[PDB]
Symmetry: C4
Subunit: 318 residues, 4 copies
């Protein structure tokens, strides 16, 4: 777990129509950062805000002895794209991500900085006081189950964006080819050592959440497609089940009619429907056959590392 000590830190905050909370956010974040006794930097990214957020950001950047860098984008690209834009400019050894709605307490930064200074590459967080509602709860349960099945371990909370990373992870991720990503998952791919911290949560003080239904469906699709290619494998299973059922039912119908003779007027249509079901299952099998190669192409185009080494131990003589 040994690592070089941290001497500078950077903070990345995506902003999108959050003029109401920005004034308090700036003061609280500045106080928290100054409480570290460490060199600090702040970067604010405007994801195509329609309100006056950009004006406040530039005004803050123009204040005397200001440590705030303002970055403007020509349109709305998304939260993670803005985070990548922020990463492209950071100069500190440790990177902190934070939300602009102020639901994440800025006062938790020093704990993350300390734990990362112990030597850990990636430090996560878990919301001890987490709202419970059937939709979010079920989604989180299924998503965490899939994540632990795939990665081999559970990360506690994936939806919390209050996290810390070291610069090498940022440099590694920034060179990836894939255009769409989920930063918390993509970070664990290159992490040699990880930990977590409990933190408390609060509701947004002003405005409304920007994640609508479609903007949430897109996020779910991105997450699932970034995790695994497994869904392409269930089509063949479903087709096999349907085909076996149809074939067995047709054979049983033939045997029953031969043994007992005619029974109903609509017997022939039933046999034809059974054959139709068998063909429909064969169609699912074919689609899964296509999906296998499609997934292979996707993985090859992605060009992720084929393996990751945790450490190498040579003897006294190489």
């Amino acid at each position: 777990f040994d690592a070089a000590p941290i001497k500078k830190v950077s903070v990345v905050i995506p902003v999108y129509n959050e003029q109401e909370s920005l004034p308090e956010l700036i003061r609280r974040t500045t106080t928290a950062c100054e409480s570290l006794g460490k060199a600090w930097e702040i970067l604010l990214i405007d994801d195509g805000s329609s309100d006056s957020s950009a004006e406040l950001m530039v005004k803050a950047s123009q204040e005397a002895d200001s440590h705030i860098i303002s970055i403007l984008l020509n349109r709305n690209y998304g939260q993670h794209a803005a985070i990548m834009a922020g990463f492209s400019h950071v100069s500190g050894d440790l990177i902190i991500t934070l939300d602009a709605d102020l639901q994440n307490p800025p006062e938790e930064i020093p704990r993350l900085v300390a734990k990362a200074d112990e030597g850990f590459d990636v430090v996560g967080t878990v919301r001890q006081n987490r709202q419970d509602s059937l939709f979010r709860k079920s989604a989180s349960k299924i998503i965490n189950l899939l994540i632990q099945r795939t990665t081999g371990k559970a990360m506690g909370d994936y939806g919390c964006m209050l996290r810390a990373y070291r610069r090498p992870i940022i440099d590694t991720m920034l060179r990836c080819h894939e255009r769409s990503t989920f930063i918390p998952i993509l970070a664990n791919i290159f992490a040699r050592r990880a930990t977590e911290i409990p933190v408390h949560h609060a509701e947004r003080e002003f405005g409304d959440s920007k994640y609508s239904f479609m903007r949430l469906i897109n996020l779910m699709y991105d997450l699932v497609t970034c995790l695994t290619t497994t869904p392409l494998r269930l089509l063949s299973l479903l087709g096999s089940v349907i085909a076996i059922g149809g074939f067995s039912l047709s054979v049983l119908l033939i045997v029953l009619r031969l043994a007992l003779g005619p029974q109903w007027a609509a017997e022939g249509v039933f046999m034809l429907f059974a054959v139709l079901f068998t063909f429909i299952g064969a169609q699912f099998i074919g689609m899964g056959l296509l999906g296998e190669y499609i997934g292979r192409i996707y993985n090859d185009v992605r060009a992720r590392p084929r393996y990751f080494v945790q450490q190498v131990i040579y003897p006294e003589s190489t």
Copy 2:
């Protein structure tokens, strides 16, 4: 909006079986360009013309003190491919695109040059006197709706090829991997600042329009495929609707028959048809599942920028 002043301009005109209009076009364009009081250049591209257009082009290029460069292609590749070929040779700071049928008045060039000299990267145009016909009007309405939904702003008129660009945009676009493109849309992807101008329109004086039905369907397909990958997402919605309807209808049939007893001779076939509809919906869901990964692969292969920066504002101390 500050930018370096313009000192040279270049004009690109695709030619394809337009011998009738070329003589007048050359004179009018030369007069318009000379009215600028600016260094000017003209490039004519032959997109595999079958008539004598190439002979007229070479003769014009061979005239004394001629500023016309003639470029010949071994076959018909298309309008935008010819425009790219022209861009590959331009030397001026500002680039002007114009049609050879002379429907676009060459006299509007100085206005575009002046407005671009103000500092704007991309200057468009809008046809104030635009022909109205149900086909074109509906197509334009739907296309503009989709464009404003995707890009976030409307461009006024996409079908008008009388436009201006600065050289950096040309260099950026010329290095893109994609083989098929729509220049007006691809230009806005890299534009930091854009404007528009009203202009008048006229019908072609000679000949007939070269865009047939199939040559228009191909253009529509290219435009839609260059805009977005959304169409791959509607298949799953349609499948979900069909499957839900079929399942509900089958359950209702079972409940009704149990409550009221037999009602019709053809009841079983109705249940079988309901099951068939459910499976057919599942098939659409599977095809959409494939489409998600196909779109991901397409975007990754394209390799467009993940974000574009409008400007960065550091404090007095970096």
Copy 3:
């Protein structure tokens, strides 16, 4: 048509289980090449022959003052792959391709060399005395129709491998990414100027043709897939036709039953079948929608030139 004069020539002959014809082939080819009065070279490629062809090839290469180079492959890759292997070693300015079964008269080489020396990049050939049989004739007719529709001109005869190319074409083709190709078509993509020559044809003197039914189906698939992506567009047309027919038939059934009342006992099943046909057509439309993006990806991965320039004509002052 001006070009540098030719001073050396090279000949490429694929060999695959042709020991019977090789002795006569070597003598006739040597005589023909020596009749040119030009520096000449010969390359023989063994495509994994099971007979003693390799032994004869090496023996010929080991003869005193022999101009024959023998190349052996670890397995059977195909005719065009062997031709590419030959191209990878040629040193002459002009390249000649010839078959090993001796159906192509070696005595026609000097005519090709002379015509190429006139300046033409690519010289083809046409079989004046061509066997007629329904299978081959219909296949050639349809293939030539498609080729002339796509490329814009007809090449006369595509199945004749007796052809000539200049070295720059070979170098251009050899750097293409695509693993499967049809050399005659891929050559015309980069040819600035082409011509043809009539030649006579004969049946193979010994052995049997190596192209079986499956080995011919694979060749047809390679040719069609190298030509165009159009076949992916007919699925949507077929689906549209089927859906329109089904919808019209269902509406007509409803109208007729309302106007005239009940007519048959099996009316409901007919309506259900009409709805089923409509959905089946929608499925074809969806598959074509997928095919559009698949073809786009294929073209982008291929990375062929976006345009080819025949010549550029600057004025007296650049």
Copy 4:
């Protein structure tokens, strides 16, 4: 078959939850390697073992005068990925692969080393005493049939991982783009000369086999997808068969009804079902049409060599 003599050898052993067999394995492998009278090296790779295997590996590496290198991975990637990780560090001229369960006798190493020293690039092995059970036997029969059909020769036994390779093969394979591979097959792609050796087999002394049902299905899929793209071609054949059958049956029904008049009450539904079957076959044809291009894209993205040269024989004068 001439090749440089071997002076150093390396051994690669994947380890995954095999603490029970590791102590005996280390001693037996050390004795076998020391019996060669040749410079030797050993590399142990931990594929994310949950038991104490890593502790034993590091302890062995820390022993005085130890020739064992221990490599740890952050998670379970697979057997072949671990073998690739081992290959990334080997320094010897010849590479030996061995299993950790000790079913492969380590005493067979010197025979492989000697035969490879004769000059062969790749040396395989065949299990003379092989367990027979319907599942494994049928799978091996079909797999070997497909392998010999594709590659042109049979390898004897593909499931035996006790094999030897020279360093150039390792370097060639290590630069391949494909993320998923089957090492024995991928090795033969670049092998100029290969041989085999009989060896005896034994059951694992401790623990249980780690290859479950799903972990075996994934391996079968990887093997088949690495071999060939043929499965995408059978869909069109099946569709053609179904469509021809349906069309013939419908025509026969029409002819029979016209000749003999009405015969059954359910005649119309039979004709409709025949039409439905024809359309279903057309759907398979379309899916195969898509599969052709998908396979082309897969092969192009893979970027394997278009041909491999066994040897070149120039005359006395080049």
